[PDB]
Every structure is written in C-alpha cells, then in structure tokens.
C-alpha cells in the first residue's frame, strides 16, 4: 500500500452532556459546571460570628421582652438573625405592631444592640406598676406581661396624668418601644384607668404622635377580646422623647442602644444551629463553593454566588464525543 496521512479530532470515555440552540443532551469530551446545587443543610457562623437564633420566638417578642423568650435578654453581636415561619411566642397578649416590616428592614442595617434601662419601674410612684399582668402570657408559671414595657394601671382609685421624658445622653442612637391598650369595653377602662376618654401623646424632634384608645366588640383571641398596639422610633443622641398620658399607656422600661451597624438579615427557617462556620449561608443551609452561581435560595448572606432559578447550567469546553 502507499503512505497516507489523516485528519481527525479527540474522543474519550466522557459522558458529560450539554444543551445548545438546536440540540439538547449532546455528549461532549469536556464540560464545565457553573451551578452549585448542594449545601450542608446546617445554620453556621459567618466568619466566626454566630447568628441570633430566636427558636420559637419572634422579633416582636425578643424586643418587647416576651416571658417565654428568656434566653434573649442581652444577646451578643450577630452576623444574621433567624426566625421560624409561625413562631408560637409572638405577642402573648393579642395585639398588633405598627411598622413591623419597616423595623425588620432596619434590623438588616444593625449587627448588635445594648439594652439600657431608661425609666425604672421604681419611678412610677403615683401609679401602681406591680399589677398589669395577664394570663396566657405566663412568667414563672404566674400571670405576667412583657419584660421591657410596663402596663400601668390606677392607684387608690386614681390615675394621675403622666408627664415624663428621657433625654438620650448616650452617643449612640436609641430604639424605644411603647404601646397603647385598646380596652375590651367601657367597664374595663373604668376598672383599669378610671378615665372614660384617655389619650397618649409621644413627641421627639422628628416624631409627634397623638393617640386615643378605641372601643370595639372584637373576637376573643386567647380568651381576651381587648387588644394591644405597639409603636417605635429611633431617638438620636441629645434628643428627648416626651410622654404624656392619663390612661391606657404601656410605658417603656428599657431602650435598645444601636452600638454596631453593618450587614445583616432576617431569614425564615425551621432549621437549628449546627456548630459550623461558613463564608456563605442560606435558610436551607450553608454553601461552600467556588461556583459563580447556585439554585438553593434567593436570600443569602456573606460572600456567595448569585441565585438562578435553573436546575442545570453546564458549559461545553471540549468537542463532540463519538461514540
């Protein structure tokens, strides 16, 4: 026979498939996966900084000081916050919370509080602060109320008009929480506060609020038709908050000093702490990957890849494998 030379291309035992415009599942010799699909399935630290895990508590319960939420008195700094879908310990006493989502958005900016007492229970001498407890909100087995706020009632058949104010002498911004009690009926408001038509006025340099408790025939939630409503504001340094009321006033005892502001988030997850550390975290679990993309969850925190809603993203590097 004569001598000859031929031209061809590479082949091997590869079975990696890729998709194109015209074809799906084309076996190629080499390929690059650019989508991270796996996670360890645990809630970890973020660069050695442990998150605040509220267990069965909500954010409202934590800040207001729910009796069941006794671990979360003076919490250390966090990388992120975790909260379950339907936390059983939210507002023990049936009630609402004004600008609750706005407050949660503000917690993304914050990494650490420091609780400080602004108005001690002892100071309320003209009023009876001992009572103002409630069943279905138990502390130590007994009827009780939120820890960080005081339910003030009458004293010796009298509720003198209140005029208090706290001046923020700290250098940090202060988160303050108060509330109003919407009474069950006219008989209850006379029983608790001795004043048919009361009011609650709150005023700072920025804020100026005027409130009045509403009477209504509401449905019995946890054996209590009467309802509570809580509010909040940031008191900047050197600014005072002026309280005035003659009834239905759920006064603050503690405020929260904003001592560190950085990157944080609140993530919906039923998972518990895993004693691990990671650079990237999701509600489903942590991601240790060098990929540019992933499909675990849209909400992440740390140094992560970007979230795609695809099941598969493979790039073809090599050529068509035959056979």
């Amino acid at each position, epitope marked *: 026979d004569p001598d000859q030379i031929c031209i061809g291309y590479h082949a091997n035992n590869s079975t990696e498939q890729v998709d194109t415009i015209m074809e799906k599942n084309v076996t190629v010799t080499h390929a690059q996966d650019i989508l991270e699909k796996t996670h360890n399935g645990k809630l970890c630290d973020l660069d050695g900084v442990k998150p605040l895990i509220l267990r069965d508590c909500s954010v409202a319960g934590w800040l207001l000081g729910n009796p069941m939420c006794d671990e979360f008195i*003076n919490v250390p700094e966090w990388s992120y916050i975790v909260e379950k879908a339907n936390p059983v310990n939210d507002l023990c006493y049936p009630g609402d919370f004004n600008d609750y989502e706005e407050l949660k958005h503000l917690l993304s900016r914050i990494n650490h509080f420091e609780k400080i*007492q602004i108005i001690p*229970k002892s100071s309320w001498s003209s009023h009876e602060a001992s009572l103002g407890v409630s069943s279905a909100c138990p502390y130590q087995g007994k009827s009780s109320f939120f820890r960080n706020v005081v339910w003030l009632i009458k004293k010796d058949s009298t509720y003198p008009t209140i005029k208090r*104010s706290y001046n923020n002498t700290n250098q940090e911004d202060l988160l303050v929480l108060w509330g109003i009690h919407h009474p069950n009926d006219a008989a209850e408001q006379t029983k608790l506060y001795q004043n048919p038509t009361t009011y609650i006025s709150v005023g700072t340099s920025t804020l100026n609020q005027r409130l009045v408790p509403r009477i209504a025939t509401r449905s019995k939630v946890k054996g209590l038709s009467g309802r509570m409503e809580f509010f909040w504001t940031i008191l900047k340094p050197n600014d005072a908050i002026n309280f005035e009321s003659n009834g239905n006033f759920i006064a603050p005892e503690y405020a929260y000093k904003i001592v560190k502001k950085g990157d944080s988030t609140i993530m919906k997850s039923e998972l518990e702490y895993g004693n691990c550390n990671t650079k990237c975290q999701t509600p489903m679990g942590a991601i240790n990957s060098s990929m540019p993309f992933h499909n675990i969850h849209p909400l992440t925190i740390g140094e992560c890849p970007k979230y795609v809603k695809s099941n598969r993203l493979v790039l073809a590097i090599g050529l068509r494998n035959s056979p």
Partner: antibody
Amino acid sequence: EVQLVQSGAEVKKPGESLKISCKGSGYSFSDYWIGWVRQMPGEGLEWMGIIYPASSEIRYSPSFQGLVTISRDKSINTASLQWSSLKASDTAIYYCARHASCSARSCYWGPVDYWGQGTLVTVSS
Amino acid sequence: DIVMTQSPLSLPVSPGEPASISCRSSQSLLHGNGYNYLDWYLQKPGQSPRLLIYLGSNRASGVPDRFSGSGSGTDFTLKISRVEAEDVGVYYCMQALQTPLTFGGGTKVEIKR
C-alpha cells in the same frame, strides 16, 4: 412579703476557708440583683458586689474583686460569699441585701430595699 | 468610683427642733429621665441598715412624713422636721448611678438634752 435570712455566725482562724450564705423568699429570686455589704466594727458600710441570679453576671467592686467570690443558686434561692485564705482584717459583720431588678447592664441599681440580719465573722489566732 | 461626702459627722438634735444632713457627690447623679439615682439609709443602733429615701425624694413604705429628700445633680440633702428617740442612728446616703455603689461617711445623730 420579702425575707432575707442569712447563715451566721462564724468563727475561724487565719488561713481557713469560709462560705457564708443568704436565702431570699417572697419574690422571684432570679429576677432581682442581690449583693453583699461589709461593715467593720465601728466603721461605715462597704459595698462588696452584686449578682444577677438568672444570668449569674457579677458586678464586683475593684476593692473586693479577685479577693472574694460571690455566688448564686436559683434552685434553692441562695446567694453566697467565699474566702480562700482568711485574715484578721476580714473580722466584720456582712450584710446580705436585695437590689434593683434590672435585666440590663446599665441602670438604677437601687433601691436596696430589703436587708438581712448580718452574719458575724470573727477571725483571730 | 463615685466618692460621696456627708456632713455633719455628728448631729445632736433637741426633741422639738429639726435636723438636716448634706450629701455631696463627685459626679452628677441626674439621669436622662430626670430622676436622681440617690438613696438614703437609716441604721438604728444594733439593727441592720434600712431603706429611708429613694430615688432622691420618695419615702419608703414605712417612713413617716417628717423625713424628706431634696436636691439634684451633685449636691443633695435629707431634712427631718422633728426628731425623736426612735430616729437615732447613722444616716447613710448612697449613689446608684454606676457600679460600684458607694456609701457616704455616715451621719451619727443623737438626742440633745
């Protein structure tokens, strides 16, 4: 109502260890700060330190820190005060007293509204 | 620490006439809320110390009308309208703004005759 019963009285010699105690009743022991006050014979009151029995966070005095160990136990509503090696200068009367009931780390530490009977600790050769 | 200074050291007072004790602070005890974090305590002879005044001016449950606290910030005073054999003892003022808590030097008050 509120009751603070102490575990006096004690007599020891220099070098010996000691643990005086104080039992609170009529309230939530874990909720209130509880502490100790020394009064040497003929002299005034000397605040030693307090402890929050829920968290066991202790607020020592610089004069007494690292020299006496304050303790607390929720299970039997008891606060204590300890010594490693006693001296003649420790011969005094030690008052147990309830404080604030503030859960924060910066607040009105008073009123010191309920005091014990004191325990006489005598220390000599 | 916050050092506290009381005066006078001894105070002989006649049964009818009143009495007054000064208590000065090294640092302002006035809080952002408006209240002064200062208490007064009475130690009757042979007895333990007892709460008399808090927080600046309010009378403790069992304290008669004669006793009254006043002042603000750095300088305070405990006034007594009438004094009797029951009221003898060492009166202590103490600050409760910052840890560690500090008591005053004490004011011994006997009956004058």
